Amino acid sequence: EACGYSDRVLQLTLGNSTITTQEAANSVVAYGRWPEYLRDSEANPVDQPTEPDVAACRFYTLDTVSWTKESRGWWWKLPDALRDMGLFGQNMYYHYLGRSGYTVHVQCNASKFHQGALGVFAVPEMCLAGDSNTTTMHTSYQNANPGEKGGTFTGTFTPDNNQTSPARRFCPVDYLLGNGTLLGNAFVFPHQIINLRTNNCATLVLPYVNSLSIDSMVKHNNWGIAILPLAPLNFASESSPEIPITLTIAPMCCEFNGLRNITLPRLQ
Amino acid sequence: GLPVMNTPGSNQYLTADNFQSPCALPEFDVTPPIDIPGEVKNMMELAEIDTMIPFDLSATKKNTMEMYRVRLSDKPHTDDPILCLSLSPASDPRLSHTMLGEILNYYTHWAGSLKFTFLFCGSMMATGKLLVSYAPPGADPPKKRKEAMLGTHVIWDIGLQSSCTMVVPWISNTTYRQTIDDSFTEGGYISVFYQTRIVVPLSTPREMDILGFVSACNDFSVRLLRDTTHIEQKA
Amino acid sequence: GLPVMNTPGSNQYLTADNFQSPCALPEFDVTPPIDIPGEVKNMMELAEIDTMIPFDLSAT
Amino acid sequence: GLPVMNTPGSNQYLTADNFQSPCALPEFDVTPPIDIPGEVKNMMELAEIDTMIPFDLSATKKNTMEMYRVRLSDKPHTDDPILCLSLSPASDPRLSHTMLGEILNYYTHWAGSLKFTFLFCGSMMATGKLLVSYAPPGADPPKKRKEAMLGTHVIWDIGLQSSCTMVVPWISNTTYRQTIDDSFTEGGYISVFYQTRIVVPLSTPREMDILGFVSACNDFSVRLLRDTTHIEQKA
Amino acid sequence: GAQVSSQKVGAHENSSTINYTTINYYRDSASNAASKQDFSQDPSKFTEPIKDVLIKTAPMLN
Amino acid sequence: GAQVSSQKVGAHENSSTINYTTINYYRDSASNAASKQDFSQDPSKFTEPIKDVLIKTAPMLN
Amino acid sequence: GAQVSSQKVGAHENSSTINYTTINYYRDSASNAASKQDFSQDPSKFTEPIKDVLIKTAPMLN
Amino acid sequence: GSSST
Amino acid sequence: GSSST
Amino acid sequence: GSSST
Amino acid sequence: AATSRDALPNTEASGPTHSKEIPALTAVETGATNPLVPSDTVQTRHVVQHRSRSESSIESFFARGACVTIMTVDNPASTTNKDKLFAVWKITYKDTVQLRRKLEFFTYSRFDMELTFVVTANFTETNNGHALNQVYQIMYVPPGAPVPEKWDDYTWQTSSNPSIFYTYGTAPARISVPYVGISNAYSHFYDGFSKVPLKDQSAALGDSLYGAASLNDFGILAVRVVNDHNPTKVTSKIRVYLKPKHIRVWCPRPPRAVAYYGPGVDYKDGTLTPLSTKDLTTY
Amino acid sequence: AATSRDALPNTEASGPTHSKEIPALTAVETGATNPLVPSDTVQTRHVVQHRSRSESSIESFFARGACVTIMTVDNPASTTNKDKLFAVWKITYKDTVQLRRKLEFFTYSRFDMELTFVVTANFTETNNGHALNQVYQIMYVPPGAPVPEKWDDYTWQTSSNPSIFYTYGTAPARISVPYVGISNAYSHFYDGFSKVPLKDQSAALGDSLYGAASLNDFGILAVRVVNDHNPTKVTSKIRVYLKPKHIRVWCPRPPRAVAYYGPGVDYKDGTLTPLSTKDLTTY
Numbered sequence A: 001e002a003c004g005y006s007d008r009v010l011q012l013t014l015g016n017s018t019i020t021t022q023e024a025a026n027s028v029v030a031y032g033r034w035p036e037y038l039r040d041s042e043a044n045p046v047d048q049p050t051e052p053d054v055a056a057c058r059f060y061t062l063d064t065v066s067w068t069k070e071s072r073g074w075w076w077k078l079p080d081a082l083r084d085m086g087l088f089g090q091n092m093y094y095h096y097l098g099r100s101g102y103t104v105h106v107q108c109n110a111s112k113f114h115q116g117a118l119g120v121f122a123v124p125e126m127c128l129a130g131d132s133n134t135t136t137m138h139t140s141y142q143n144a145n146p147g148e149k150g151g152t153f154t155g156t157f158t159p160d161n162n163q164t165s166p167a168r169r170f171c172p173v174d175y176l177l178g179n180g181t182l183l184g185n186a187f188v189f190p191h192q193i194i195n196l197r198t199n200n201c202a203t204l205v206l207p208y209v210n211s212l213s214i215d216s217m218v219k220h221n222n223w224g225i226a227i228l229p230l231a232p233l234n235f236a237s238e239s240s241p242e243i244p245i246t247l248t249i250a251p252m253c254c255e256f257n258g259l260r261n262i263t264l265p266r267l268q
Numbered sequence B, D: 001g002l003p004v005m006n007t008p009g010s011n012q013y014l015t016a017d018n019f020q021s022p023c024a025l026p027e028f029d030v031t032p033p034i035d036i037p038g039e040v041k042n043m044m045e046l047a048e049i050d051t052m053i054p055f056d057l058s059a060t061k062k063n064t065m066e067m068y069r070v071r072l073s074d075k076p077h078t079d080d081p082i083l084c085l086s087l088s089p090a091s092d093p094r095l096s097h098t099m100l101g102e103i104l105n106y107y108t109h110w111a112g113s114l115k116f117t118f119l120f121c122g123s124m125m126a127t128g129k130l131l132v133s134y135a136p137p138g139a140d141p142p143k144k145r146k147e148a149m150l151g152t153h154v155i156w157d158i159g160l161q162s163s164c165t166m167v168v169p170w171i172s173n174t175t176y177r178q179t180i181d182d183s184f185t186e187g188g189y190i191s192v193f194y195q196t197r198i199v200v201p202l203s204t205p206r207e208m209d210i211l212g213f214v215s216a217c218n219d220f221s222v223r224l225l226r227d228t229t230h231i232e233q234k235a
Numbered sequence C: 001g002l003p004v005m006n007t008p009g010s011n012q013y014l015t016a017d018n019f020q021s022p023c024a025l026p027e028f029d030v031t032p033p034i035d036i037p038g039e040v041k042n043m044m045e046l047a048e049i050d051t052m053i054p055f056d057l058s059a060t
Numbered sequence E, F, G: 001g002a003q004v005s006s007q008k009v010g011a012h013e014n015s016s017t018i019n020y021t022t023i024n025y026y027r028d029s030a031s032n033a034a035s036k037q038d039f040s041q042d043p044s045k046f047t048e049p050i051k052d053v054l055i056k057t058a059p060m061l062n
Numbered sequence H, I, J: 001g002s003s004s005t
Numbered sequence K, L: 001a002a003t004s005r006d007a008l009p010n011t012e013a014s015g016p017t018h019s020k021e022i023p024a025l026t027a028v029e030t031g032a033t034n035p036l037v038p039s040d041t042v043q044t045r046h047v048v049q050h051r052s053r054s055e056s057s058i059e060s061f062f063a064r065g066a067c068v069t070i071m072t073v074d075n076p077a078s079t080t081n082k083d084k085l086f087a088v089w090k091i092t093y094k095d096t097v098q099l100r101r102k103l104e105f106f107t108y109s110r111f112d113m114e115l116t117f118v119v120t121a122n123f124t125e126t127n128n129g130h131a132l133n134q135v136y137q138i139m140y141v142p143p144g145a146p147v148p149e150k151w152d153d154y155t156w157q158t159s160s161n162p163s164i165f166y167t168y169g170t171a172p173a174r175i176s177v178p179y180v181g182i183s184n185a186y187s188h189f190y191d192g193f194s195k196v197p198l199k200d201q202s203a204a205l206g207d208s209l210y211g212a213a214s215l216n217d218f219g220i221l222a223v224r225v226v227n228d229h230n231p232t233k234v235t236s237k238i239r240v241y242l243k244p245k246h247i248r249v250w251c252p253r254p255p256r257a258v259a260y261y262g263p264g265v266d267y268k269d270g271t272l273t274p275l276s277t278k279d280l281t282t283y
């Protein structure tokens, strides 16, 4: 705008939380769909839903990770990364059913003398490959669901040889997007690129996507967030630079059905 | 009953046929559709999305994340190529496995215009001008800026708009090219050059990467459906 | 006669099919229905009637 | 389903049949036609174009360029034939391999009028009058001008209009003749004679060639498609 | 004599009622296919066979 | 109940729309052939999923 | 969608146009039989390809 | 003719 | 219906 | 009857 | 209103430019692909376009019968000590690789299904006896229904299960199936489990496979030769072809780049390097 | 508006002439054929013409199924040391001579194609065993697609290639193909090369065959017997018949006068003298 408004400068407000950014590269709305509540024509559980509004639909900041020249990539699953986040988590665990959309805001700033580009991908149904060559589909629920902590990509497939006490975890090779497909094509998924000369952040608005109108949030993740270094971090002449990446996520239009006693999962 | 006479084709099974057949589950209560985001109507929609090119398939960079990174440096001006590429979208090793290359490998014939976009992933303090070229087939493939310059090209100036797009225009003798390497339907040559050189200040990295993307233009189409060589099942 | 071309599915017997077939007893004088009480139109009508649950299936 | 009853002819394959069959490539994007010059709608168009006759198939002229040249000379008047030819357009060795003869060899029956045009390839200083004749079948084939004269003929005077056309008119008992030698459907006799003689001055060549051409008239037609003997494949 | 009826269309193509056609070839009704155009009734004669009509919000016994 | 539709005629004979006819014989939609009368959509939800509409002649970032 | 056309009747019975009927069953034109309703053209582009139109009664060269 | 439904 | 010719 | 298209 | 077989846009004539409009310059960081046509970066003539995307429509891409399995059955001599082999197949598109890869370009799908059955038989021994023409029974057993244990037990009665009786030598058998999913669309991928491990409950009880939803998703096809035991043994194979008709798909995915290893997204060591050597500056 | 089956022009009555009009005299040097009818050079009566050129129309001339190839396949005993023979045929009208000669009356053509398949089988050994009825798979493999190496490898799955499953003894198989060329018309002749020899480049690299355009023009037909190995061996042949329907042709050419020698216009020594001896003055 003529009196100063810009595509790089955004303010987002949800509940009692506000995010400001002075160096954005617009925002992505996945598949052109803004989040919405479940319509009566697509509804299925007949009981009155719980809709927590401002208490759950607000910005939760997860633990900050660190980007270095050794960094192969990081991944998170939704709703899993938010499972212990305030009243969103409580509402999630007290109900059999739940659905939610999300605003994902990835934060990474550096300086006009740094280089590097992060691919921020939102994958619907991000099924990842496990660590075994003798058995298939065997990653334990505990290993499959890291919570806020997330997981990482590796540059090398290294098979779990302990047949008597199997590790039962994923082994996500980065150029294969951890799922057997080439990373260069991951751009057909909703994404943004944090290229350090251009922007400090990525912002993706994600609708609820599923083959069902509502589902078990505890048994099933709808979206996976994959962040990979498309171009490695570099600074001045320092052989070992580091810059933080902070992930902040807000649930949107979340509703819950089937209230009963709280689910206490075996997470270890 | 009615006098009929069986024609050739009777009782055969053509896998591409389109006939009615009896339903094994009559009156089955079908679950209705819901409005899932992301519906696709045509495979060419996918070919129009930018995908990253594995430009450096050298023996040590191939099948690693490195294959996607084209390294540049602040070295003095040369007229030698940064990269060279044959316009063979389904068969050239660098293009054949990109989303466009993949969809093309399910078809025998392709047609239309393509566009290459390059992203500068260097620091903000780094400047430079590059020349991106397309030479239609028939002459010596360009190995020096002077020949590349004579064909379809874009001179990219690096600055706040990080990326530059060169459109490879549909220039062919035939109405459709094949999805294999074939001299009769050869597409030509893409090459990139330094117009001036990358210039950095002190305290700034002297080497940086560019990333490349390919996608199809709205005039692009494919035909004659076929099986791909990019997946198989020995035993 | 009329040019025809047999498609796949020809001569098979699908047990769930719905076709016409010749009647073995033509012009048979059918006995008419009378109004018997208790007609059912759909199996779900029966599922809507209360039935008693065998709650205690203990060994004895 | 519908009561049907299979008639004779069921399941056979007639190579001349005309039925619908399933398409192996559904929804294929067909390349459109462009307006190529030279479209043909009917094979008889080709039979109406003049083609050169191999008149001299003698043991040393046949299968050489010489077979096309009929030599004349300034010798004194004679009533003997320059050339003699049977009107058998598909089977006579001189006509059977001309474009008309060739198209006729893909059919069993022919009908209509034919025209022979002769071209004088001598010098401008050479003059002469020739008689071109057509005798319908049934009598002694003409071996002297006096008999040829009694039938259909043209007296050609050589001068600025280099060429002369004799039309052989359709005169047959049957509605169609056969494309083989057969006495019942014999066409008759073409022969050429000197009416006066070729006269040259001194310093001028005393021998020259004429070329002959045959083509069909607009009332000409052919029927009952068949395989030719003019091409084959041993093994 | 062609009978034309509506299909209940479940999974639609990326492609308005769709119909199908039926012709009976035989004189005897027994020879005919099943129409499947069937009617539903209310379960009352089995579920509520009581002489005095029940009001679900009121006491069943009064 | 006969459905009549147009063919897209590619190679023409040396011989005005050409049509073809379709009749559905079965009550269940599943039994039906594929119409192939399909619709196309614009790639925007995949190619341009950004919140602020882009103008290709203007700077993408401003 | 039935197409009805005339036959050129050669040998007649001791028995008014006679017609035949055609219905296309398939969506692709390639699947269709040959119509045989073809057109004729004049041979001029091959027989008379000269720039100045010829009058057969006049001298070809003047 | 056609009995519709 | 019937396209005549 | 005939549904045209 | 745009049909799949409509022609693509015409190329418009475009002249020289000296302007502040910058179509060539962009920023892919935004997540968008730059919508450029040749007339944005080069001078173009007017072309009247005739090409169409008809054959790359989702229907057209899948409108082909693909082999999803080969079932083996036999009919032995009465005297043999081995049981007469009838076949049981857990129904899926994942036992072969080709159609699976095409469907996996998308996350979700709805379709009606056409199943076509090709049946071939042959003699096994250098014997010289004969077999009269075989009739085959293909019974669908949905989850819950009694699975056959013997070629001739009561289950083959099929009072309620759909069965096809195929006669050898006739045109290949064919049926259509509606969209039978308990979801609003078939999930090609399921990032989840069918059980929740509960703290209070033992590890063994809470365990389930990653990516697997209903243990018996859609039941099985059971096939047998209805003919009684013949002195000369004949072995037969039933090839099943699947065609997705009236199909709709959602959420695009990159194609499988490395060899399939089982029903899930897992990859095996040694099959992970698909790309060939080619040098950066070599055409 | 002139139909192929329209009657040709009537002969008009023509009387005697003493005129300056000269229809008989002409000059073929011009390139033109003299358009004369009999009434120009002889006295004629009135004839009402009834004959037609209907059967010499381009459709009519080509409306016949012609044999373009014979493919051989077999199904041997499991125990044999030789592989089960499946057939691979590079598709063309040039492997046989008759239809090739008719199409070569013209330089260019457009047509839809009808392919009809006649399949016959027989026993090879003085053996006495049997074979049950064979089913054959005819798969079209378009250029780019994986060509089969074994009768039973993954390629025969045909998820995207068009396949015909033919049952022995049934009516001969038949399919239609659209105009599939990447040109606006099929070139029966191509006076050129597919490569340019460049000075700077080595002789070997710039070399290509005269008259040959796309190395793999249209792909191949791969045929196999789907039946498993039988103790008694059966050999089978598939004869392919091609009919050009909905055909258009451009630029007429003289017919092939000497025997065909390979895919091009080449002639072999010793086959060059087609014409017989006949004397100039002998009827």
Ligand SMILES: CCOC(=O)c1ccc(OCCC2CCN(c3ccc(C)nn3)CC2)cc1
Pocket: B024, B025, K091, K092, K093, K113, K115, K138, K139, K140, K162, K163, K164, K175, K177, K180, K186, K187, K188, K217, K218, K221
């Ligand atoms: C989760 C992965 O698998 C699938 O999504 C998927 C796999 C298979 C699909 O087919 C649906 C299941 C069945 C439905 C019923 N069926 C029948 C029914 C009757 C008969 C005689 N024969 N087969 C055969 C297939 C549909 C989807």
Ligand SMILES: CCOC(=O)c1ccc(OCCC2CCN(c3ccc(C)nn3)CC2)cc1
Pocket: D024, D025, L091, L092, L093, L113, L115, L138, L139, L140, L162, L163, L164, L175, L177, L180, L186, L187, L188, L217, L218, L221
């Ligand atoms: C240049 C010389 O050859 C030709 O011009 C010429 C030769 C062959 C011609 O046929 C076109 C090629 C193919 C097209 C597709 N085709 C098919 C397609 C599907 C099936 C099952 N079987 N065959 C078979 C033939 C057409 C032209």
Ligand SMILES: *C(=O)CCCCCCCCCCCCC
Pocket: E001, E002, E023, E024, E025, E026, H001, H002
């Ligand atoms: C009402 O049925 C009038 C229209 C009939 C159209 C033709 C029906 C198809 C042929 C059926 C023949 C009779 C079957 C015993």
Ligand SMILES: *C(=O)CCCCCCCCCCCCC
Pocket: E002, E004, E021, E022, E023, F001, F002, F023, F024, F025, F026, H002, J001, J002
């Ligand atoms: C609408 O369909 C009315 C016209 C019907 C014409 C006859 C159709 C051909 C016979 C179909 C018989 C029924 C098939 C189940």
Ligand SMILES: *C(=O)CCCCCCCCCCCCC
Pocket: F002, F004, F021, F022, F023, G001, G002, G023, G024, G025, G026, I001, I002, J002
């Ligand atoms: C125009 O075609 C309307 C009249 C149709 C009469 C019935 C045609 C015979 C049955 C054809 C069935 C469809 C074939 C795919």
